[PDB]
Amino acid sequence: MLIPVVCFTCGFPIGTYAAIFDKARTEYIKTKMLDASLQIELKDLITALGIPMRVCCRTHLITTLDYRKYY
Amino acid sequence: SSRSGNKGIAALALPTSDMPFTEDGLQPDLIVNPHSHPSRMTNGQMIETTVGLANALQGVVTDGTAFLPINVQLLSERLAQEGLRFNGCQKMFNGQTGEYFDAAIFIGPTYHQRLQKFVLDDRYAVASYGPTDALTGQPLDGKRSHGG
Amino acid sequence: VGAGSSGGIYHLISRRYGPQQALKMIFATQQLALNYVRNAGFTVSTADMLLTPEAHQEVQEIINELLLESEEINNRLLHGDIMPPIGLTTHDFYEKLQLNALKFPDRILKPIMNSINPETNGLFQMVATGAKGSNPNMIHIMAGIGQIEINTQRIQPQFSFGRTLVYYPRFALEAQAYGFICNSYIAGLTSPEFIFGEMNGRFDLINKALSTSSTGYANRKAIFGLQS
Amino acid sequence: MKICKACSSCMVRTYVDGNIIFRCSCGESVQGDSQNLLVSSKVYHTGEMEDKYKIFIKNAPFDPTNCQIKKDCPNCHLDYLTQICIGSQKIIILVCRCGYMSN
Amino acid sequence: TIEINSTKFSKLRIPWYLIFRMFGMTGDDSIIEQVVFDLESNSLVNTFMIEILEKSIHVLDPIFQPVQHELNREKIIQFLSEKVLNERQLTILDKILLPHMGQTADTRVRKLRFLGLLIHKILLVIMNV
Amino acid sequence: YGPIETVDNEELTEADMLSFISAAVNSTGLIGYNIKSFDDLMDNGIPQIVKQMFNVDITYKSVQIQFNFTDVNIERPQHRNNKINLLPNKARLCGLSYSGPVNLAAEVILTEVKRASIPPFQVSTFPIMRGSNRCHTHHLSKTAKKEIGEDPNEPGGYFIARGGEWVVDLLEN
Amino acid sequence: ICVAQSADTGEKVGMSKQLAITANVCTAGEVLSLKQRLLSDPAIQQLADVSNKDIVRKGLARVFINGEWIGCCTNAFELAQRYRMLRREGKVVHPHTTIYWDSMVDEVEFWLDVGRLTRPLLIVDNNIEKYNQACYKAAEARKKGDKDWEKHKIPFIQNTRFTPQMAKDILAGTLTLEDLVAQGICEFITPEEAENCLVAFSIIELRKHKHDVTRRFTHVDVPQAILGLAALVSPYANCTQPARVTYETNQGRQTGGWYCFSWPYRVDMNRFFQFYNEMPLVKTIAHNYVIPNGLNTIVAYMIYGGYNQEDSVIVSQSFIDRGGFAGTFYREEKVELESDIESFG
Amino acid sequence: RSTNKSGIVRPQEIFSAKPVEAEQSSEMLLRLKNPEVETNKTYAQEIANSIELITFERLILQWHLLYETYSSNVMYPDFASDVEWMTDFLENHPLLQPPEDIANWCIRLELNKTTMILKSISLESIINSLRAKHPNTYIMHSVENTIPIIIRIYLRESAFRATDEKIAVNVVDKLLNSTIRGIPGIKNANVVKLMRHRVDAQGKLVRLDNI
DNA sequence: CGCAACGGCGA
DNA sequence: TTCGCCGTTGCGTATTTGTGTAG
RNA sequence: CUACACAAA
Numbered sequence A: 001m002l003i004p005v006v007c008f009t010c011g012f013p014i015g016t017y018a019a020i021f022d023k024a025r026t027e028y029i030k031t032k033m034l035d036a037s038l039q040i041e042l043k044d045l046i047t048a049l050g051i052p053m054r055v056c057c058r059t060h061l062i063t064t065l066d067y068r069k070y071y
Numbered sequence B: 001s002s003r004s005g006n007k008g009i010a011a012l013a014l015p016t017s018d019m020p021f022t023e024d025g026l027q028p029d030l031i032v033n034p035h036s037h038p039s040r041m042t043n044g045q046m047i048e049t050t051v052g053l054a055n056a057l058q059g060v061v062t063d064g065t066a067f068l069p070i071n072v073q074l075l076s077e078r079l080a081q082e083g084l085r086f087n088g089c090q091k092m093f094n095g096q097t098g099e100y101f102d103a104a105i106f107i108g109p110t111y112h113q114r115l116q117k118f119v120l121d122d123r124y125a126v127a128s129y130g131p132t133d134a135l136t137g138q139p140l141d142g143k144r145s146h147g148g
Numbered sequence C: 001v002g003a004g005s006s007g008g009i010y011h012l013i014s015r016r017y018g019p020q021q022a023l024k025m026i027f028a029t030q031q032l033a034l035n036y037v038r039n040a041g042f043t044v045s046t047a048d049m050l051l052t053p054e055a056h057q058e059v060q061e062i063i064n065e066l067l068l069e070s071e072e073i074n075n076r077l078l079h080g081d082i083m084p085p086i087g088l089t090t091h092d093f094y095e096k097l098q099l100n101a102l103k104f105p106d107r108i109l110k111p112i113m114n115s116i117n118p119e120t121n122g123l124f125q126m127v128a129t130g131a132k133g134s135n136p137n138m139i140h141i142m143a144g145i146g147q148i149e150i151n152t153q154r155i156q157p158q159f160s161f162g163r164t165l166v167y168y169p170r171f172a173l174e175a176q177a178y179g180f181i182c183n184s185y186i187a188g189l190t191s192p193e194f195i196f197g198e199m200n201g202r203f204d205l206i207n208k209a210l211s212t213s214s215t216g217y218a219n220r221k222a223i224f225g226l227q228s
Numbered sequence D: 001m002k003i004c005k006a007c008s009s010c011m012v013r014t015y016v017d018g019n020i021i022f023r024c025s026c027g028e029s030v031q032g033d034s035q036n037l038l039v040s041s042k043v044y045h046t047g048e049m050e051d052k053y054k055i056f057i058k059n060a061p062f063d064p065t066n067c068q069i070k071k072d073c074p075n076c077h078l079d080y081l082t083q084i085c086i087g088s089q090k091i092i093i094l095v096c097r098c099g100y101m102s103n
Numbered sequence E: 001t002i003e004i005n006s007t008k009f010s011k012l013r014i015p016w017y018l019i020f021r022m023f024g025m026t027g028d029d030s031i032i033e034q035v036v037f038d039l040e041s042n043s044l045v046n047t048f049m050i051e052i053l054e055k056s057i058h059v060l061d062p063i064f065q066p067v068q069h070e071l072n073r074e075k076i077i078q079f080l081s082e083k084v085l086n087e088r089q090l091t092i093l094d095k096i097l098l099p100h101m102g103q104t105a106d107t108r109v110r111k112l113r114f115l116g117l118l119i120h121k122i123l124l125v126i127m128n129v
Numbered sequence F: 001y002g003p004i005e006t007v008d009n010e011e012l013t014e015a016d017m018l019s020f021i022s023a024a025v026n027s028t029g030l031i032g033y034n035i036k037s038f039d040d041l042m043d044n045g046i047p048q049i050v051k052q053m054f055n056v057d058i059t060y061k062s063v064q065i066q067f068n069f070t071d072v073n074i075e076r077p078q079h080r081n082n083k084i085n086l087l088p089n090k091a092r093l094c095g096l097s098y099s100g101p102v103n104l105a106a107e108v109i110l111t112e113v114k115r116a117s118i119p120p121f122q123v124s125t126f127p128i129m130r131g132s133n134r135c136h137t138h139h140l141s142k143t144a145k146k147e148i149g150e151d152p153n154e155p156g157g158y159f160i161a162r163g164g165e166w167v168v169d170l171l172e173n
Numbered sequence G: 001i002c003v004a005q006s007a008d009t010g011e012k013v014g015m016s017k018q019l020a021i022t023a024n025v026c027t028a029g030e031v032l033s034l035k036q037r038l039l040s041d042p043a044i045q046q047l048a049d050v051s052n053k054d055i056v057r058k059g060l061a062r063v064f065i066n067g068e069w070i071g072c073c074t075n076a077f078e079l080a081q082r083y084r085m086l087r088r089e090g091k092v093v094h095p096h097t098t099i100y101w102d103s104m105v106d107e108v109e110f111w112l113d114v115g116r117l118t119r120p121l122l123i124v125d126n127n128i129e130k131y132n133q134a135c136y137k138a139a140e141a142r143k144k145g146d147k148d149w150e151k152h153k154i155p156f157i158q159n160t161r162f163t164p165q166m167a168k169d170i171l172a173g174t175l176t177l178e179d180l181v182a183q184g185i186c187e188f189i190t191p192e193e194a195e196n197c198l199v200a201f202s203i204i205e206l207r208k209h210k211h212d213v214t215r216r217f218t219h220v221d222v223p224q225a226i227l228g229l230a231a232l233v234s235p236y237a238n239c240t241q242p243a244r245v246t247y248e249t250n251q252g253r254q255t256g257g258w259y260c261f262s263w264p265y266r267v268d269m270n271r272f273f274q275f276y277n278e279m280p281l282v283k284t285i286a287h288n289y290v291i292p293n294g295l296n297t298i299v300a301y302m303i304y305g306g307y308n309q310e311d312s313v314i315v316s317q318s319f320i321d322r323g324g325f326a327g328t329f330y331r332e333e334k335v336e337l338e339s340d341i342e343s344f345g
Numbered sequence H: 001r002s003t004n005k006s007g008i009v010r011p012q013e014i015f016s017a018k019p020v021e022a023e024q025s026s027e028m029l030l031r032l033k034n035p036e037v038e039t040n041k042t043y044a045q046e047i048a049n050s051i052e053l054i055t056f057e058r059l060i061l062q063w064h065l066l067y068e069t070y071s072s073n074v075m076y077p078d079f080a081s082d083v084e085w086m087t088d089f090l091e092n093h094p095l096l097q098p099p100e101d102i103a104n105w106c107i108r109l110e111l112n113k114t115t116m117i118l119k120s121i122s123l124e125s126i127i128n129s130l131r132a133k134h135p136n137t138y139i140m141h142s143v144e145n146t147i148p149i150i151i152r153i154y155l156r157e158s159a160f161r162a163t164d165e166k167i168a169v170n171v172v173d174k175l176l177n178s179t180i181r182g183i184p185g186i187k188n189a190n191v192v193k194l195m196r197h198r199v200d201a202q203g204k205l206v207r208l209d210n211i
Numbered sequence I: 001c002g003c004a005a006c007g008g009c010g011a
Numbered sequence J: 001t002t003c004g005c006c007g008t009t010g011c012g013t014a015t016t017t018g019t020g021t022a023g
Numbered sequence K: 001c002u003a004c005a006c007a008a009a
């Protein structure tokens, strides 16, 4: 229902920056302007968050659905 | 199952130290046999893994809708431009021994689905006693009737 | 070492030492192979099924020559030069000519194998060692599907009078209108090609669905006729 | 068809004995001769295609779903002709909207 | 044979020309014309159609023997009522025979035209055209 | 319309036609056909079925009975606690039918004549599609649906009968 | 009908069909208004004025509305085309009516009954009238003996009026399908009317035959419209063997996820709520309208000890522990009290 | 596969012990005599043509059943230009006189010359087959050495002991179904290349591919 | 949906 | 008088698993 | 227990 506390694959704690990432991503998408928002590159944002260049961690960070955005 | 129709039953669960890992520490959630592909022709899953490898590095979510233009050569070159190999393969080490495989292993994010078929629901074991039919005197039918 | 391989090493082991020894040897050889691949490693990749641009051009040329032969047959039909043999109508003879013309030549493997390293290609090694897959599988994945046949004939004009699909005109003569797929799976079929492939796949699923009941009734009748 | 002139009904043939008597239900007869002596016939694959597809062949140039080919209409001088491939013998008919009906 | 699968009528295969006769237009050539659309027309289409119609008229119906050659509507309609009050049967017939054509007395010649068109289409399919 | 020679389309990509797909799906609503069919039913078809097709006039042995229904109305589902509204979640939990009341008014003619008129009355209850114009969640915001225990992201299209949810199929005819 | 979605096993293969993504079901239209318009049309001869002889002698074409023969017209094609244009305008003829012209029996059929399948198709217009005019001019030049008759001919143009600006407006919510229909950009086509349509399967194919006068498409399709919602979940489905796309349509509907958004207020039986869901890294258009169920698992395609042979999968115990595909299964126990005899205690 | 062998049809024929008339995939393999001559494809093809069943209906372009009779007479107006060859046939066959009890029926058959040549069938062969099989008819034919071949068949009197129309129609059916050449029940007969073993003079077992 | 007795009436 | 025909009845159409729903 | 529906191999 939220971004997981740790990455499902390797256990890196992406949940430390889950909330900061969500709100910073909403902000960064807003200045960059449903599908065109998803194609905005978040490499720099996630790197500035401190998360490493790990396929699993960025995958689970950017793809996890937020229940609050749907309910 | 994957979104390309490749069903699978979870046969083995390994701890994090027993699972194979790439040189940069990436390890799988699922290990899928390559023999599931050649007869089933589920190239969409393979292409989706190749595309999602670069999507995860770029931090994007792209469209893989059917009949959209696709160029697997350009997707592989995109993998190369992202800093990976032309194929999505990487140097992998065996988690149990620590020895690298001689072959680079294709590893990447493939969207997988958990089909609602639970072994805890499907499994059944009955002993020598239980409810029997009044007419035939045989056991009742199946798990629902608590004998069969 | 394959399963169901008459004259294979396990069959000989069973013949000489007993089937239990053959089962033990199957387990032992399986452990040897798996422990070897524990270090060798085996994989299949999207690049394992990708043709080089030169091989792609060669496959395109092969398909173009097939379509050229088909167009020559069509030109013969336009001039009234299609003369069926006795017992065959002009339509049936034309259909046979188109079915033979659009068959993939055995040299379709040359571009496939020029793009393949047999020492490192997981897909090719699975196919060639008999582990899984076939040459038609590799050709469909990499080179092209070719002609879709349902009951040993092309796509019949079921949409309307003389029409196979809403995408093709009435009495179309091009091979693509009757189920010839020029694309491979890796290239990605177009919408009508995917419709024809779906027709073929649904036909296969229906065959598997109804053969079970027919063969089951036959099997029960045979069992009851023979069980005594 | 032999229509009775009194009651407007079909008349039977009744070839009795040496001639043809068009016996009707009401009783009137015409007898007749010559043409009325063909009891039955069958013609094997002679006369087809154009007769049974006359409406379709007429409408073909206006049906947008019919195939077209890049050749001139001699009567009309367009560059395209509607192509028809009818029957099990695959007769190719090129027809134009002007009226050209290349047999 | 034309069969109406309504409530009162079922398994009763009334000959087509009899149904045409019960709705007026007693002329048998006119009944044929309702199927062929042109009585005095050439071409192998109309000839084959008309020959089939001849054979259909000149066959002994095992269950409509008395009215097979009858030319008045009264006897045919009364026979139909027995097998299933003249104006009652003929009014209850049009409530079950092509209601989309209309259910009133006025829409009967057009109902017969539509029935002839249906028979023409079936016989065209018989030609394998 | 303008001319076809001067339509600028060379930069129309294949991912632009997915916008046409989106327009089609948004127009239909992905469920909208059967909700619209049900709305058409209980707006015009049920009145058609009642006002027409039911003006019976029979004669018995002699005696003749003639009566027709003039007004028909279906209300949103109701419950007994003063006729409180029946919410879909309450029907699902309590095992009720999400059926809406049907109100009929009929006039009897006998023939001497006796013009008797019957006041409108509840004749029965008609099952209600979720999201139909007679559903309590028809014109509701997502938050408003959430406060009544409803799924805000679902479109409806089904029936609640004896607690279960049922789908009336699209039959091939 | 989705060409992929079906059962993959059993007798139910191909039994339960699925609507395609753009397919709709028509409601009953104003058949009486169109009937009045047709019977007041000077081009349609009434049934009581033309006899069966005149229909075949003058080549009259029978006109049907909802299967009811209402008259005859001088030429079926012109009447069908005129009413198609009227439907394109949308004022006098409802856009959801079916105008079918049978060229083999010369009949115009109008259908407005409930249950017709419809889908919107973009209209392809061409300059075939101007093309023919140029051809006749070039022929006249040839007759006169001009040595430059080719310059009289004009190239053939066929195209759709859909433009990328309209795509942007559709995505921006300004433009809707109703505005597309009212502007004449697209029209609804029913399977019976689809037999009168020559459809380009893609805008790529329409562009390929843009100047081809021998391929004069009436409409242009969007290739994703041949699939249903569950079939569009599969990514790069046209790169997969279609039977496996059918397999996915079956498996895409048993996938665990957020089975309901109001689950805590429901007492449901045999229902599984999976906590964590992810958008696919490679999503499809099906996820614009339905929630994605599943996770973006990292998958290694490799042999690892022979525990994943014959459709087995080796899973990470840690991935299971962290919540990968974890959820809550729900059962219910409803027991009635019958009458006053029974009670709970 | 394709001669209905689809499904369980052939196994159902085998296991249900279906009769010969109920089989949909009946086939024979016939070897030529003199194993020295079963090596020429042309001879085998000639034999295959010679054994394939040919009925009268396959050589008929069209046939007409006329009520007209003949006297050694009222005639149909359409086939009026036939009197020339009727006179020719009557004068060239002084032994086959028209029946003294000839019946008032006729069958005017138009022969397909292209089919006749393509099957190496002669007019004399057809007429001889017709007379032998159908004694109570009187065959009259045009001249083959030319306008198409016309054959007129008059029922004698004995075909009638049902109206005479019905008897004439059944006689038409019997004539059209009469076999001209070949053995019954053989729709097609194609030549196949056979692999067979044989022992030579040296005692070696050689696989003969050219049979 | 098909297959096969069947048994009663036309030959 | 001995057979075809023809409605007219029955019989049968893979196996083993689950879950519901109702009567 | 008798339907029926949804599923699995």
Ligand SMILES: [Zn+2]
Pocket (backbone or CB within 6 Å): A007, A008, A009, A010, A011, A012, A054, A055, A056, A057, A058
């Ligand atoms: Zn990670």
Ligand SMILES: [Zn+2]
Pocket (backbone or CB within 6 Å): D004, D005, D006, D007, D008, D009, D024, D025, D026, D027, D028
């Ligand atoms: Zn008379």
Ligand SMILES: [Zn+2]
Pocket (backbone or CB within 6 Å): D073, D075, D076, D077, D078, D096, D097, D098, D099, D100
């Ligand atoms: Zn012209």
